[PDB]
Structure formats: structure tokens, C-alpha cells
């Protein structure tokens, strides 16, 4: 709904699914904060 945290890599696939792969804290999430 707003901000994107630094360290967040957006690993996207053509299916239309963005899925989070943060290289810093090492975390994975389907909820994208930019939306």
C-alpha cells in the first residue's frame, strides 16, 4: 500500500505473480508492499 524496503528483490514471473526474495534478511512473501 506504500513503501518498498531496501534489500527487497522483486523476483517476478510471467504468470503475473510477483514474489519476494529479500537478499538481506532472507525472507519470502507474496504480499507486495508497493501495491
Amino acid at each position: 500500500l506504500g513503501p518498498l524496503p531496501p534489500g527487497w528483490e522483486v523476483r517476478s514471473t510471467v504468470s503475473g505473480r510477483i514474489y519476494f526474495v529479500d537478499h538481506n534478511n532472507r525472507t519470502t512473501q507474496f504480499t507486495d508492499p508497493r501495491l
Binding site: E9, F20, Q29
Partner: peptide, 13 residues
Amino acid sequence: DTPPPAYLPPEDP
């Protein structure tokens, strides 16, 4: 979609 995979560095055009 299903539960999220492990983390990789991204392929994004």
C-alpha cells in the same frame, strides 16, 4: 498462488 519459493536474485525485464 501457492506458498512462496526460496529466495533468488531476480529475472525481471
